[PDB]
Amino acid sequence: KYRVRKNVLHLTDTEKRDFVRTVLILKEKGIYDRYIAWHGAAGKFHTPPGSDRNAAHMSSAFLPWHREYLLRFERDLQSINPEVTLPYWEWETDAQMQDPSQSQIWSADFMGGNGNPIKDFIVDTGPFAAGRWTTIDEQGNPSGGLKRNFGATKEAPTLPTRDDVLNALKITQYDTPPWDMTSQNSFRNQLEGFINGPQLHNRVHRWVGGQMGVVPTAPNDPVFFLHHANVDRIWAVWQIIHRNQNYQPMKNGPFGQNFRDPMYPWNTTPEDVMNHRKLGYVYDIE
Amino acid sequence: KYRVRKNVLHLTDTEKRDFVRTVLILKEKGIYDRYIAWHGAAGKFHTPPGSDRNAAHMSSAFLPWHREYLLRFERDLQSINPEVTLPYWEWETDAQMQDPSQSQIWSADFMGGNGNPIKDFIVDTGPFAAGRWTTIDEQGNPSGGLKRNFGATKEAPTLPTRDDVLNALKITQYDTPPWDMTSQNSFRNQLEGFINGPQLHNRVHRWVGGQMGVVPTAPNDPVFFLHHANVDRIWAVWQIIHRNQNYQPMKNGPFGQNFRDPMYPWNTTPEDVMNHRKLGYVYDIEL
Numbered sequence A: 001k002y003r004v005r006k007n008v009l010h011l012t013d014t015e016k017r018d019f020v021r022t023v024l025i026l027k028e029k030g031i032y033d034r035y036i037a038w039h040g041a042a043g044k045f046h047t048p049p050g051s052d053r054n055a056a057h058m059s060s061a062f063l064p065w066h067r068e069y070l071l072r073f074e075r076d077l078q079s080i081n082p083e084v085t086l087p088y089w090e091w092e093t094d095a096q097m098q099d100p101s102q103s104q105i106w107s108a109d110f111m112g113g114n115g116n117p118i119k120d121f122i123v124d125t126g127p128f129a130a131g132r133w134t135t136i137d138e139q140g141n142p143s144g145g146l147k148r149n150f151g152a153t154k155e156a157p158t159l160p161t162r163d164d165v166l167n168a169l170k171i172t173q174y175d176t177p178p179w180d181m182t183s184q185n186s187f188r189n190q191l192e193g194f195i196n197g198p199q200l201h202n203r204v205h206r207w208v209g210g211q212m213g214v215v216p217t218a219p220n221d222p223v224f225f226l227h228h229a230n231v232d233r234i235w236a237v238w239q240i241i242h243r244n245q246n247y248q249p250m251k252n253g254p255f256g257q258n259f260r261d262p263m264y265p266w267n268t269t270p271e272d273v274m275n276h277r278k279l280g281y282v283y284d285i286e
Numbered sequence B: 001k002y003r004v005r006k007n008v009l010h011l012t013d014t015e016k017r018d019f020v021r022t023v024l025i026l027k028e029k030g031i032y033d034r035y036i037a038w039h040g041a042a043g044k045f046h047t048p049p050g051s052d053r054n055a056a057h058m059s060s061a062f063l064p065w066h067r068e069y070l071l072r073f074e075r076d077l078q079s080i081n082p083e084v085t086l087p088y089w090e091w092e093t094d095a096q097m098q099d100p101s102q103s104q105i106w107s108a109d110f111m112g113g114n115g116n117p118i119k120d121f122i123v124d125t126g127p128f129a130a131g132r133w134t135t136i137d138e139q140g141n142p143s144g145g146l147k148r149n150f151g152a153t154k155e156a157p158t159l160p161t162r163d164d165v166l167n168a169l170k171i172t173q174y175d176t177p178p179w180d181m182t183s184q185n186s187f188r189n190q191l192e193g194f195i196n197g198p199q200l201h202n203r204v205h206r207w208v209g210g211q212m213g214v215v216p217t218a219p220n221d222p223v224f225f226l227h228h229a230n231v232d233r234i235w236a237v238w239q240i241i242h243r244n245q246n247y248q249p250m251k252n253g254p255f256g257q258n259f260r261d262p263m264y265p266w267n268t269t270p271e272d273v274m275n276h277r278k279l280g281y282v283y284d285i286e287l
C-alpha cells in the first residue's frame, strides 16, 4: 500500500522529468531491452502449442502476466531512483477530448508527440525522438526510430471511453472456457479487448500505431508501460468491486493459465500477483 | 557435493528408465517446453543488439548460462523423483569407436537411434520417436517429430576426441576480448567451438544433426541436456585445474556478459553459478 502510482495528469513537471530520466538510464544500461524481449518471447509461447493462446495474451494469464511485468519494471526504476513509481495513462478520459493528441501526455517533456507524416510517422519530438532513442525489430535487431500514428486506422480510430470501462466492470466472471479470444461473459477478454474488438486494451495498442500496434515490437514505445498501468488499475478496481470473485481457471485449463502455474518466461504464478497491494503498491485513486 | 552426475555409460537399467520416465512427465506437464523456449529466446537476445553475441552463445556467458539452464532443469527433474539427476554424454570416448552410432546411449531403452532416411531422418525408435514425443519449431508450433542424422556433414563428420578436450584444458584465459566468436586463446571460445570451427560443443550439435544442428530447435532433443552436462563437466574440470583463474570479463564487457550481470532471460548472474559444488552437485569423476 505504500508506493503510489498516479495519473499522468496529476504528475508535477519534476515527476515527469524523473520518470523519463530513469527510463533513459534503464535503456542505456541495457535493462530496458530485456523487457522488450520478454514480452515478444512470451508472445510466441503458445499454451498449448498449436493454439492461439500465448503466455501473455489472448488467454487468462493476460492480466497477471502484465502485472508481474510492470512490477518487475517498477523495481528496476526504483533501483535507480527509489522515489519513482509507474504512472498510468487514463486513456478513457483522454477519449473525451475533441483532439486526444493534444493531451498533456504527448508533450515534449513527457512521451513526445504523434509521428510526423513527412518522416513516415517517425516520432521527432520529446525524449524518445529518433536520434535520442533506438528501437529493435522482431528479430532483436536495430530498427532506427520510434513511430506513432494516432487513430489512422478504421478498425481503431478512437480511444476507448469511460462507458466502455464501466461496461467491462459490470461483468461478473474473471474468465470463462475456453479461456481465449472467444471467451464470453469474461472480464479478462472484455478488458483485453477481443469481444467485438478491437476494444479497450487492444484498441489502445492500435490507436497509437507504430511499434505499439503489433505485439512483438510494442514495448519499444515507453507509453506501453503507461498504457498497461491503466489496464492494471482497471483490473485492480474490478478486484475491489467483485471482492468474492477470483481468478479462473483455478485448474484444468492449459498449463501456464491456471492459478498456480508458472507464467513463462518467469516462475511467477497468477496467485503470486493476484492481490496488488501485497506487491507494495496502490493506485492514487485508491 | 551431495548429488552426483554420472556418465551415461555407468547408469543402471533402472536408472536409465527413471531418467527417461521423468523427462516424459516434464514434457507432458508442459514444463519441458519452457526450456526449449528459454533457449530459443536467449538465442535471439543480442548483447548488444546488432552484434553477433547473444545471451546464451557466442560470448563469455555461454558457459554459466548453460550451467544455470541445466540446474533449473535438474531441479524440475527432482520435483518428480528427488533421486533423479542429470547424467552426461562423454562424447570424447564415444569418438574412439570406429562407429560412434553403435554407442549404448542410442539404445531403444534410452535416447533411441539415428534418423530414418526413408522418412526424412525422423527418429522412429526409442522413447522419443515420432508419435511418442511431439516437437515444436522455431515459431513455437508443432513440427511433427525428432530428427537426427549422425555425422552427415562435411564440416562435422566426427565427434570430438579426448585430445581435443585435453588441448582446450591447456588454455589459461577463461575468455578474451572482444568476448565473442573471434576470441583467441580463450577456454570459453575453444570449448564452445569457434576456433577452427566447428569443434567440441558446436561440432557435437552438427554431428547429431536434426533439431540438434540448429540453435532455436536444439533442445527438442533430450540429448541436448546430456551433451551440455558433458560441456559443464569439462568447464568444472578446467575450474579445478586453474584454481586461480576467474571468469572474464569482470567488467566493461557488453551488458549481460560481465561477472555480475543478469543473464537473460533470468536475473541469474555468472557469479551465482561459478562454483558448481555450491549448486549442490558434483560429477562422478570428482569422487
Ligand SMILES: N[C@@H](Cc1ccc(O)cc1)C(=O)O
Binding pocket: A057, A197, A198, A201, A202, A203, A205, A206, A212, A213, A214, A215, A216, A218
Ligand atoms: N493483437 C491485438 C493488439 C495488441 C498489440 C500489442 C500487444 O502487446 C497486445 C495487443 C489485436 O489484435 O488487436
Ligand SMILES: N[C@@H](Cc1ccc(O)cc1)C(=O)O
Binding pocket: B057, B193, B197, B198, B202, B203, B205, B206, B212, B213, B214, B215, B218
Ligand atoms: N552454432 C553452432 C551449432 C549450434 C547448434 C545449436 C546450439 O544450441 C548451439 C550451437 C555452429 O555453428 O557450429
Ligand SMILES: [Zn+2]
Binding pocket: A201, A205, A228
Ligand atoms: Zn498490451
Ligand SMILES: [Zn+2]
Binding pocket: A039, A056, A057, A215, A218
Ligand atoms: Zn502485449
Ligand SMILES: [Zn+2]
Binding pocket: B201, B205, B228
Ligand atoms: Zn549447445
Ligand SMILES: [Zn+2]
Binding pocket: B039, B056, B057, B215, B218
Ligand atoms: Zn544452444
